[PDB]
Structure 1
């Protein structure tokens, strides 16, 4: 086994460093501030949170409501719970209608895929 690393672990690492590229805009990337968080959602989550991406104030809500440390910033733990909120959304997408549809939801969350 050359690849000790696993599917989830690599996936987490990829998330961590990319989220941190938005976080690193302040230097030692220890957070996502209002601007960094908005951009983060605007670029990568633009699809999963696309409905949310259409408004700035909704993102502003996650921006500071999740700001448990109350600095208008998001620490690893704070933005990570954002991923849980999004997990609940992807939980709803997890019920793929393709097995037997009662009502069809859009791909990946809201996505249009041929």
Structure 2
């Protein structure tokens, strides 16, 4: 795998680390997802100064989740990560 592809695989690996733990191996409960995000994106979250974006990440977690839904969250975290790399 390329460097880019190692990153994609690693993201998939982290998902699976959480998703394997209970029930079906490829999905996670909203509760488990909330825990994954709060731990694995702790620094990302701390650096987001727009509370509406944080709201975007956690939205609906109190209302199973699959990899496709997890991608949508990864996409948000990626936008945030890029913006932060340009912090003066």
TM-score under structure 2 normalisation?
Answer: 0.72
Count of equivalent residues: 81
**Relative to 1, partners in 2 of residues 1:62 and 1:49: Cα closer, same or farther, differing over 3 Å?**
farther
* Deviation (angstroms), 1:51: 6.5
Given that residues 22 and 39 in structure 1 are in contact (C-alpha distance below 8 angstroms), is that contact kept between their aligned partners in structure 2?
Answer: no
2:82 to 46, 71, 91: 91
Query: 1:108 is matched with which residue?
Result: none
Q: Which runs of no fewer than 5 residues in structure 1 stay unpaired?
A: 53-57, 65-71, 98-114
User: Which whole-Å CA distance do the structure 2 matches of 1:17 and 1:38 have between them?
Assistant: 17
User: Which whole-Å CA distance do the structure 2 matches of 1:17 and 1:94 have between them?
Assistant: 24
1:76 equivalent to 2:67? Answer: yes
Query: 1:43 is matched with which residue?
Result: 39
Given that residues 34 and 63 in structure 1 are in contact (C-alpha distance below 8 angstroms), is that contact kept between their aligned partners in structure 2?
Answer: yes
Query: What is the root-mean-square deviation of aligned Cα atoms in Å?
Result: 2.4
Given that residues 21 and 29 in structure 1 are in contact (C-alpha distance below 8 angstroms), is that contact kept between their aligned partners in structure 2?
Answer: no
Q: Greater share of helix residues, 1 or 2?
A: 2
Larger RCO of the pair (alpha carbons < 8 Å, separation 6+):
2
Computing the radius of gyration from Cα coordinates, the structure with the larger value is 1
